[PDB]
Design an enzyme around this catalytic site. Structure first.
Site, short mmCIF file in Angstrom:
data_model
loop_
_atom_site.label_atom_id
_atom_site.label_comp_id
_atom_site.label_asym_id
_atom_site.label_seq_id
_atom_site.Cartn_x
_atom_site.Cartn_y
_atom_site.Cartn_z
N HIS A 224 0.87 -1.21 0.00
CA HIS A 224 0.00 0.00 0.00
C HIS A 224 0.89 1.25 0.00
CE1 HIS A 224 -3.55 -2.42 0.36
NE2 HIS A 224 -3.66 -2.45 1.69
N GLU A 228 1.48 3.70 -3.45
CA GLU A 228 1.17 5.15 -3.34
C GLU A 228 2.40 5.98 -3.71
OE1 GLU A 228 -1.80 6.23 -3.10
OE2 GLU A 228 -0.88 8.34 -3.47
N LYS A 231 3.31 5.72 -7.55
CA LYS A 231 2.35 6.50 -8.37
C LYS A 231 2.78 7.96 -8.41
CE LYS A 231 -1.86 5.53 -6.92
NZ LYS A 231 -2.89 4.88 -6.08
N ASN A 232 3.14 8.53 -7.26
CA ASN A 232 3.49 9.97 -7.15
C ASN A 232 4.81 10.24 -7.88
OD1 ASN A 232 1.41 11.29 -5.57
ND2 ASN A 232 1.90 9.75 -4.08
N1 LIG Z 1 5.13 15.84 -6.71
C1 LIG Z 1 6.29 15.34 -6.29
O1 LIG Z 1 7.39 15.79 -6.60
C2 LIG Z 1 6.18 14.24 -5.44
C3 LIG Z 1 5.21 14.21 -4.44
C4 LIG Z 1 5.11 13.11 -3.61
C5 LIG Z 1 5.98 12.03 -3.76
O2 LIG Z 1 5.87 10.95 -2.93
C6 LIG Z 1 6.95 12.05 -4.76
C7 LIG Z 1 7.04 13.16 -5.59
O3 LIG Z 1 7.96 13.24 -6.58
#
Ligand SMILES: NC(=O)c1ccc(O)cc1O
Ligand SMILES: CC(C)c1ccc(COc2ccc(CC(=O)NCCN)cc2Cl)cc1
Ligand SMILES: [Cl-]
EC number: 2.7.11.2
Length: 341
Positions: A224, A228, A231-232
């Site tokens: 999980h 998550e 994905k980001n």
């Molecule tokens: N938007 C971002 O740079 C970013 C945000 C959250 C995360 O876990 C990883 C990322 O690169």
């Protein structure tokens, strides 16, 4: 009825945090002991959070989303009561209890998006000021952590009493779960974008160089969190490079120390300014009318649940490091439970 009375009775007790050790032994004593434990401990845990829900101001408490969730908790407590007087030696008692647990688990499946509707309504009906944000954050961290702890108990019971001990893998290969979560994220990322970054894993077994890193953990929790974060890291890497042609990989280091097992996911997604980091963990600021409640704050509760953590450190213009901190030792892996008072 007696729901308020029950809430008052059982909210006098402290939840009893279990270690991995205690979780493992329950899956050797046997089913009778799990029944007699759970028929006390679930009402304690239900009652403790229900009492907190009842302390919310009337303008939150009176909204349909909270009333609906409050009603699930009431039914689920009453379903567990039926069994307080029942006789553990009757195998019909025991199988009925398992049935009752599966129903309760299913009944609460939609809590996150329901609570998310309550947040949306509060934002539009009362506003999104910093004091509102801290109270939502305070309440939901405790509520969701409580809920994670209740699902753990139910899952351990229903999975053991129909190598792995229910949801626990005493030989969890951390890198294998990293690859699994990456492979899934890649699937979604390839579908929504014409590209996906590659994966590099490095392991650092401090005490036992080149020995593959294993731990006692709940691999679905670890999946999980890693899913998550992948994905980001993929959204950011892809969107920040859509005019570029090269696509930097996502680099994961797994470190095993004397007490920490640490997983860093490093991307070159162009980063976020320090000012905007707190928002990514905020239920309020991340609620609106990832890839194609919320992932980051709830992933951090999964890490906190066995005395770990999840931190983000970005470098605006370069990229972002996300670190999952876990306890290396099953002895230091104890439930972290919000206690009412
Ligand atoms: N938007 C971002 O740079 C970013 C945000 C959250 C995360 O876990 C990883 C990322 O690169
Ligand atoms: C997740 C949903 C259901 C939700 C939505 C909103 C809230 C937020 O509830 C608030 C808002 C403001 C204040 C400050 C104040 O003025 N206190 C006075 C309290 N009487 C306290 C609380 Cl507990 C929690 C949970
Ligand atoms: Cl159990």
């Amino acid at each position: 009825g007696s729901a308020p009375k029950y809430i008052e009775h059982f909210s006098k007790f402290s939840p009893s945090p279990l270690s991995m050790k205690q979780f493992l032994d329950f899956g050797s004593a046997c089913e009778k002991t799990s029944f007699t434990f759970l028929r006390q401990e679930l009402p304690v845990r239900l009652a403790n959070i229900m009492k907190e829900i009842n302390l919310l101001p009337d303008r939150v408490l009176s909204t349909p989303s909270v009333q609906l969730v409050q009603s699930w908790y009431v039914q689920s407590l009453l379903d567990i009561m039926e069994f307080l007087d029942k006789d553990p030696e009757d195998h019909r008692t025991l199988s009925q209890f398992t049935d009752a647990l599966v129903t309760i688990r299913n009944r609460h499946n939609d809590v996150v998006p329901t609570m998310a509707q309550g947040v949306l309504e509060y934002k539009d009906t009362y506003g999104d000021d910093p004091v509102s944000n801290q109270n939502i954050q305070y309440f939901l961290d405790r509520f969701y952590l409580s809920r994670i702890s209740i699902r753990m108990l139910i899952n351990q019971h229903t999975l053991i009493f129909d190598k792995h001990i229910g949801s626990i893998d005493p030989n969890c290969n951390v890198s294998e779960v990293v690859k699994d979560a990456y492979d899934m994220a890649k699937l979604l990322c390839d579908k929504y974008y014409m590209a996906s970054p590659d994966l590099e894993i490095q392991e650092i077994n401090a005490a036992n160089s080149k020995q593959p890193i294993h731990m006692v953990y709940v691999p679905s929790h670890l999946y999980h969190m890693l899913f998550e974060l992948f994905k980001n890291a993929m959204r950011a890497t892809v969107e920040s490079h859509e005019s570029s042609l090269i696509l930097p990989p996502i680099k994961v280091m797994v470190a095993l120390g004397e007490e920490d097992l640490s997983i860093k996911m490093s991307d070159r997604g162009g980063g976020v300014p320090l000012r905007k980091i707190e928002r990514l963990f905020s239920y309020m600021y991340s609620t609106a009318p990832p890839l194609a409640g919320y992932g980051l704050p709830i992933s951090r509760l999964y890490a906190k649940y066995f005395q770990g953590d999840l931190q983000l450190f970005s470098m605006e213009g370069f990229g972002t490091d996300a670190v999952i901190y876990l306890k290396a030792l099953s002895t230091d892996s104890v439930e972290r439970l919000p206690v009412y008072n």
